[PDB]
Amino acid sequence: IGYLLVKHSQTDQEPMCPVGMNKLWSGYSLLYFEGQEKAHNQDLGLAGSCLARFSTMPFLYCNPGDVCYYASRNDKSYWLSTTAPLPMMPVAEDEIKPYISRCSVCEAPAIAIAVHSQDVSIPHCPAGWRSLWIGYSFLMHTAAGDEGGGQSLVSPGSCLEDFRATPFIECNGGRGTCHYYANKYSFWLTTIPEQSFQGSPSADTLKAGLIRTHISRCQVCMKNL
Amino acid sequence: GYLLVKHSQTDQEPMCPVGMNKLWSGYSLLYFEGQEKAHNQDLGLAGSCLARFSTMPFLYCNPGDVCYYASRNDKSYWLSTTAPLPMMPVAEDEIKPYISRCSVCEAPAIAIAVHSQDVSIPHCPAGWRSLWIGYSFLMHTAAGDEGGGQSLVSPGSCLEDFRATPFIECNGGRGTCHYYANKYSFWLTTIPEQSFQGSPSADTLKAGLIRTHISRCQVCMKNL
Amino acid sequence: DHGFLVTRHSQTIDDPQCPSGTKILYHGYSLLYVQGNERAHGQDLGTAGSCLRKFSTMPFLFCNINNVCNFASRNDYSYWLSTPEPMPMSMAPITGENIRPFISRCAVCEAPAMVMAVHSQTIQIPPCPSGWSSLWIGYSFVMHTSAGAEGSGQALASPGSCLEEFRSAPFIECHGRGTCNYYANAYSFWLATIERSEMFKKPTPSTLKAGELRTHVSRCQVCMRRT
Amino acid sequence: VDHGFLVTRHSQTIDDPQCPSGTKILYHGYSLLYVQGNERAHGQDLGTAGSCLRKFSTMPFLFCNINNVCNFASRNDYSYWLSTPEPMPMSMAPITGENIRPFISRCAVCEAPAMVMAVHSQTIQIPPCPSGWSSLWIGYSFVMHTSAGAEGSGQALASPGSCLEEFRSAPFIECHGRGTCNYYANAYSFWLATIERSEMFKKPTPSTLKAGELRTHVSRCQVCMRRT
Amino acid sequence: VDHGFLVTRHSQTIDDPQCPSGTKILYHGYSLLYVQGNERAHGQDLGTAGSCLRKFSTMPFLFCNINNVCNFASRNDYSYWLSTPEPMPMSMAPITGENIRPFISRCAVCEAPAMVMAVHSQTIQIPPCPSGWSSLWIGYSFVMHTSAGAEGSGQALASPGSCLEEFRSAPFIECHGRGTCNYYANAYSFWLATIERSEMFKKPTPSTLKAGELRTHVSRCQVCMRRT
Amino acid sequence: DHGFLVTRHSQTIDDPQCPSGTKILYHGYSLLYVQGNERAHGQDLGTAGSCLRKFSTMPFLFCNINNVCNFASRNDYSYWLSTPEPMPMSMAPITGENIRPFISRCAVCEAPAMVMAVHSQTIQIPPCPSGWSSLWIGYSFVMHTSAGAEGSGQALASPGSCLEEFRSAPFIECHGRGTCNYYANAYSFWLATIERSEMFKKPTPSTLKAGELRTHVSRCQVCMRRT
Known about the structure:
Protein name (chains C, F): Arresten
CATH architecture of chain A: Beta Complex
Number of domains of chain A: 1
PDB class: structural protein
Distance between the termini of chain A: 12 Å
Domain Collagen IV NC1 (chains C, F): 3-227
Largest sheet of chain A: 9 strands, antiparallel
Domain Collagen IV NC1 (chain B): 1-224
CATH class of chain C: Mainly Beta
CATH superfamily of chain A: Collagen IV, non-collagenous
Protein name (chain B): Canstatin
Radius of gyration of chain C: 18 Å
Number of strands of chain A: 18
Oligomer: heterohexamer
C-alpha cells in the first residue's frame, strides 16, 4: 500500500532493507536545518530524514524582493552521527564522510511504530505486531542557542539502536566543515523503577558505564498482516 | 562618588585600592534568569556585587496579586572562583568555595577599561593610572540561548584571571550549583594585523595555547 | 488486517474507553510536552507518543559531549494534560502522590483504518468527510505556551487537535525537582468561531469570562474511514 | 480497500485546486501555513488537512488562561497563509478587510487509495516517482520559512507539503489580529538547493540570484501515490 | 563643581514626581519601561533619562529596511510603560485612546550635584545609605520583568531604577502599535527577595504570597547621593 | 576632569573629529554588536566599547568547559555601523579588503563633564537641558535586529541613541567566515515624531519611501554639562 520504513544505520554504511521491502533510496541521516537560527527538523522515522545528497548547506532562501541566497549567510545543517570516536577539531569536505550516519527508505506492507518501556526491560510489541529492532528511547536534542528538536515517540525515529551521548553533528554551511561542540545535548526517556507513577525524582549524574541502565528501552514494531 | 567594583574570582573578598572607602562586599552576580530570560548585571557596576548570596535571590509577581518565591524553575548565575570544576552539582555550604567575591569601593574618579585586541597590554590614556591588567571578557551563554555580556569600557570586561568557564549556574529551587557543558565564555581575540583583519583563519586552541590569543586589557582611573 | 493507532485522552483520572470499532493496546498518562535546556518539544496528542505508561515530573535525562548524563539536576519541565481537579486553595506547588489526581489518563487503541479531525470554526459540529464515521466530537485545540513562553501545538488534521472537554487550563506544569502547578502564563489557544461575514472583515476583539468561553470556541469531530 | 489516506493540495491562487487524478475530493478551504501566538510559531504541514481550513480570518484563534478568561484578537498575534500571485499594493501598506481576499490561496483535501509522498531530486530535474508509484503533481522543494521574530515552521521532506507547484519568492502572506496583512522584507522562504553528487562533500559555492534566475538553484520534486 | 550627574524619578501616577531634595529639575515626561520590535525587547534603565520621554504613544517608534522603506505602526509591535494605580476596566478588555491617559506614569529627569546610587537590604528593613551619603528616596527592589513572549528587560541593581517607590504587582502596562493597552496574566515583575544571612547557602524555602502579604518577601532599597 | 568619555561615530570611512571642548584619546571602527552562539550582545554606541582599534569580521572567540577554545569555526556574527558606500550591484557578500570602505569610523574623546542625549520626538531639535551645551544634533536611534531577529539597542539618555546621519541601513552584517553584506531583514528602529494630539489617539499607520523617511524620525541633541 506504500508505508515507508526508514532506517538510520548510525554508521557510514547504508542499512539494508528487510527482505521483501524494496529500497526506494538511500541517503544521509538529516536531523535538522537551521536557517535564521531557527531549527526545522525532519522526523527520523519519516523518509524526509533521509536525504539522497549530502551537503553542509543543502538549502537556500529567498525573500519577497525576488532575491535568493545560496550558502551566502551563516546557516547550518545537523545530521545524525555515526558511532565513530569524536574528532578533536572540525572536519572538512571528504573528512566528513565517516561521521555522517546513512539511511535507507524501504517500502513496507504495513505501518511501523515505536513502543517505549520507560524501564530497563524491553517493551513488548503489541499483540499481532512483530519486532523490527530494539533500541534506546531518543527524545530530543539541543545544540546552538536554544535550537534543536525532537522525535515523536510513536515514530521509529525515537528508537535508536545505538545509544550515543552526542548522536548528531553540526555542519557550518558556508565553511563546509562539521564538528561536535560542547553545547550539544541529547535527551532520552529515563527508566523509572516505579510501576507507573514516580515520586520526586532523585537527581543524579551518570558517567560512562553507568548510563545505559537508566535509559528507557524501545522496540520498533510492524503490524503482521 | 564613583563606584569601583572589584571581583576577586576567589572565595576571598578583594581589598579596595588605597584611598578608596569600601562600601560593602558581597558575591559576584552575573545574571538572573526568570522565565528563561536572562537579566544581567554589568560586572563593572555595583549591582553585580550582591551582599547576600542565595541560589534564588529573587521572586516574581503578576497582575493577579500573587507572588511566588522559589516556587517555579528559575536560576541565578555567579562569577566563578578559579577553583577546579566539580564533577557533580554542589549543595548549600559546598557552594561557597565556587562563588567569586567582590567589593564596591568609593573612588575619587571614574574607572574605564581599555582593550588592545593584541598580545600587548594596552596603554591607559594619558593622565590615567592602571588599577589592574587582565583579559578581555566579552560575553557568555549557558542554558538555552540565554546569557549576557560586558560593556568593553566597563571594568567588568577586564578579568584578571582568564577562565574558560568563568561562571557557575545555580538551580534556584534545589539550592545547588554546577558547571554544565553548554556554558561558553567569549573573549576578544588578539589580532596580528595593525587594525584591519582579513578573513579570519579558523582555529581550535587547547590548554596552554589559549591565553596568547586572548586580547589584553587594563582598568584605568583618571589621575586627579 | 491492517492496524492504525488512535489515541484518546480522558482529561480525568479515569482511563478513557477506546472509541467504537477500535481495540485497546494500553492506557497511560497524557503527556503534552517537555522542555529541556529551554527548548519545548511536544508529542502530538493524537499520537501514542502523548500517552506514557509511566508518569514522572522528569521523564527524561540529558547527556553531554563528555559522555556524562544528568538526571533532574537542572531546571527542565514536563507538561501533562490535566483533570478537573481544582487547583489547591493555597496555590502552592503540588508534590509527590498529591500530583496524581491532576494528571489526565489516555488510551492507545488499534483501529481498522485511518483517523482524522475536521474543524467547523463555528459552534456547530463539522460533519465527518464523505466515507468516514464519527469517533468523537470536541473543541479545536491549536497550541499552548507556558514557562518562558515556550510551547508546542497540535496538527489540525490530527485527533490531538480535538479535545473532548474544553478547559480554560487544559494542562499542568511540572518541574524536575518534583513540583507541579498551574501558572498564570499557562495559555491555551483554540480555533475561534468565525461567521462567513467575518472572514474578510477586521476581527472584532472580545474578552470572554466564565460561562461564555466554550460557546466561542470552534468545534471538531474525529472521524475514522469506513471499511 | 481504501484505508483513508489523505493528500492536501494548494492552488496558490483564489481558485480551488482540483484533486489529482486517482484521488477523491473531500472538501476545500483556505491555505493556512502557520500561526504565532504569544510570540511562538506553530505550523501546519502543507501536505495535511490541518493546513486547509474552511474559514479564513486574520485571527483564526483565541487564547485562554487559568483564570477562565479568554481573549480573542485582544493582543498582538499573527496568522500566515499561502498566498496568490496578487501583487502587493503600490503603497506597500497593509491590506485590510475585503482587500485581503485576492491574496489568500485555496486548498483541497483529497482522499487517496494509497500512500502519498513527495520525492526531491536536489537538481533542476524532476525526480521520477518510485517504481510502481504514479504522479500526482510536480513542483519545487519547499522546506521551511521564517518571518516576524525569525519564528516560523516547515515541511516534512516526504510530505506533499514540501512540494509547492508554483515557485514564489514570497509564497506566504503575514496577517495580524488587528485585521491587516502584508508582505515583509524578513519573510524568508527556504528551499532545498541543487546539489551535484561530486560536490556533496565540498565547501558549497555561494550564489546570489535575482529575478529571472531564482529557480536555477531550486531542487525539484514530484508527489507520488502507490499504484494499487 | 557640578559634573552633570542625572537621576530619573517615576511617580507611578499621572502627576509629575518632584525632584528629590538636593537635586535640580531638568524636565518631565512619561515613564517608558521598554519596547518590543520584530519580537525583540529593548529596555531603558528606569534610573536613566532614557526611561523618561517627553511624548507618549502606544507606538513610539518606527522601523526601516535596506530598501529605504520605513513602516510606522504597520506590523505587530509593543511599548511598555510604568503604570499608575488606575484599576483595570471591569470588562478587562483593551484600553484605547484617551482612556489610556489615566494609566501612564510620569517621570522627572533631575540633575544631582554628586553621584547617585541605589542600595538594597535584601530584608524587609530599609538599607541605610553609605556613610557620607544622603537619602533621595526609599522603595522596593525591582530587578527585571517579562511579558509577551517572555521578553523583557531589567534594572541595574545600583541604579535608582531598581528602587521603585511604590510596590505594585503590576507596575507596568503593555501597549500595542494598533493603539490598545492592557494588563496581561503573563506580565511578570521580578523583585529582589528577602534573604536571611544564615540561609544564604541553604536551599530556599518556597513561598506563595497573596494580596495583603506580597511585600513580606520583597527586599527594600534606598536611593542615595554623595554629600557635597 | 574626573575621567568622562564621549564616543562619536562618523558613519563614513573618515575619522570623526572630537566635539568642541573634548580631547581625542583614540580612533577606531564602529562596532554595533556581536552575536555568539545565537545570542546578541551590543556595545552602546555612546560608549568606548563601540569603538574598537582593530576591525575583524570575527573579533572574538569562545571557550568551553573542557578548556578548549574555538575561533571562527562556527557561525557567529559581528555587526558594524556602516558608511554611505553603496551595496555592490551583485548583492553578493563582501570579503577581505573590500570590506573596509563599508565600515564606519569612531573617535573616543575625553570630556570635562558628563554628556547625555535628549530627544524631541518631533521634527524639531530638542534644546539642551538647563546648564548643558550642544555637542551635536542627530536622529533618535533606538534598536535594531538582523540575523535570527537578534539585536540590541541604545540607551536613550546616551549619545549612542543620537546618530548624526539618518540611514535606512545604518549597519552591516559580518560573519566569522569573513563575509559581510546587507540583508533584507536588517531592521533599524528609530523614535517616531508624535504630535501632541496623537499621543492618546490610535497611531496612524504609514509606510514611507525614499525622500520622506528622515522627516518622520525624531530628532535629538547630544549635550555636555557646562563647567
